[PDB]
């Protein structure tokens, strides 16, 4: 997964979000994104085994709702549907 997070950083650099990466505050906002993969399936395809795990930090966590382990996984299922499409 180190090559995976390196590819993620390279994609962030290549995309239009390179402006947010150049801006220092938005750079920290992007670094707040967790490049964490939850393995799904046994020997499945690289697309299906892919999963995005995002972790908030205060004082943004007290306002924004994310895929918490004890929540409804609304963002998780929305991202899964959009990822299938």
């Amino acid at each position: 997964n180190y090559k995976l997070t390196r590819v993620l950083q390279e994609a962030v650099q290549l995309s239009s979000l390179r402006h947010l990466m150049n801006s220092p505050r938005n750079s920290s906002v992007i670094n707040g994104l967790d490049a964490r993969v939850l393995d799904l399936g046994h020997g499945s395809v690289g697309w299906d085994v892919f999963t995005l795990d995002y972790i908030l930090y205060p004082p943004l966590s007290l306002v924004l709702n994310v895929n918490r382990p004890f929540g409804r996984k609304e963002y998780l299922r929305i991202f899964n549907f959009l990822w299938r499409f």
Binding site: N1, Y2, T5, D34, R36, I55
Partner: peptide, 30 residues
């Protein structure tokens, strides 16, 4: 989380071992 966690943990272990080997500046007196 485990990646950066183990990275920082290895760094902290090395730092603590080096600080303990270097004369142990932490002390308590009476």
């Amino acid at each position: 989380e485990q990646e950066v966690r183990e990275h920082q943990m290895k760094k902290e272990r090395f730092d603590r071992a080096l600080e303990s080997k270097l004369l142990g500046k932490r002390h308590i007196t009476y």
